[PDB]
């Protein structure tokens, strides 16, 4: 996260770290959506142009974390993966369309003060909140700058951007399965997700029921926090039918 700040303790209890077993390193962010299911970006697991194709045994999920590098004894919980499910129409060839994946855990994780699931949006909450100017929140342990790494989980609040402005900021083909967020050059603030924040959640707090909803997944961006560029996020609601189908079939 670029130009963010340190998270408060328990501020994002659905935040998950995807952790590579060998060599031990941060792979991506992710989010907890139930006691057995974790949501992330497909490109965290599968991206052939960069020779990336992780299997279940390659990875661990670490839940309840705050510190990036330290083993948070008595606080974090570490889970093994039972199965990875990548969206069957994930477009790694072109533009990361449908950049979404689910991971089923081998065993349920116990919720605690530091470990708790986020909600997935219904149609109405999505329609109400996914509007230009409305702010969401991104969290992660990714780079502090495009070109280092944070001691603890970082957080930044960012406004959703008008679709034509998103489209006009890039040569990449944007789809309805994406949205973009960030400040414009003219505005007096900045901030962005970056490498390593990939797969983590873009959340919004519903003013109707005071619950946090995951509207987006950190997907892609041209550099990080560049003037005139925006961060792009997988549109979770648009892909919720697939999420439901996977959980109903394999849950």
């Amino acid at each position: 996260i670029v130009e963010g700040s340190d998270a408060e303790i328990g501020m994002s209890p659905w935040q998950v770290m995807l952790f590579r077993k060998s060599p031990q390193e941060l792979l991506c962010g992710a989010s907890l959506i139930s006691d057995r299911w974790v949501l992330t970006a497909a490109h965290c697991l599968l991206y052939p142009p960069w020779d990336k194709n992780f299997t279940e045994n390659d990875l661990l999920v670490r839940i309840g974390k705050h510190s990036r590098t330290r083993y948070e004894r008595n606080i974090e919980k570490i889970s093994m993966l039972e199965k990875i499910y990548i969206h069957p129409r994930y477009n790694w060839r072109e533009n990361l369309d449908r950049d979404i994946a689910l991971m089923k855990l081998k065993k349920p994780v116990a919720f605690s003060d530091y470990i708790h699931p986020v909600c997935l949006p219904d149609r109405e909450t999505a329609a109400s909140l996914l509007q230009a100017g409305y702010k969401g929140r991104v969290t992660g342990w990714g780079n502090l700058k495009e070109t280092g790494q944070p001691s603890v989980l970082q957080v930044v609040n960012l406004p959703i951007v008008e679709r034509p402005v998103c489209k006009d900021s890039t040569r990449i083909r944007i789809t309805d399965n994406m949205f973009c967020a960030g400040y414009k050059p003219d505005e007096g603030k900045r901030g962005d997700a970056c490498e390593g924040d990939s797969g983590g959640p873009f959340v919004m707090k519903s003013p109707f029921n005071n619950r946090w909803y995951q509207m987006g997944i950190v997907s892609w961006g041209e550099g990080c926090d560049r003037d005139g560029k925006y961060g792009f996020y997988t549109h979770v609601f648009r892909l919720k039918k697939w999420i439901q189908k996977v959980i109903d079939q394999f849950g």
Binding site: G10, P13, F111, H116, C119, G133, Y134, N157, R211, W212
Partner: peptide, 27 residues
């Protein structure tokens, strides 16, 4: 059923330092 309600915030009626920024953006 309990999704999206944080034990250290919503569950104990405490606000985090910047959530108000989000609310203020929601017309």
């Amino acid at each position: 059923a309990d999704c999206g309600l944080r034990p250290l915030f919503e569950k104990k009626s405490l606000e985090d330092k910047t959530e108000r920024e989000l609310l203020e953006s929601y017309i």
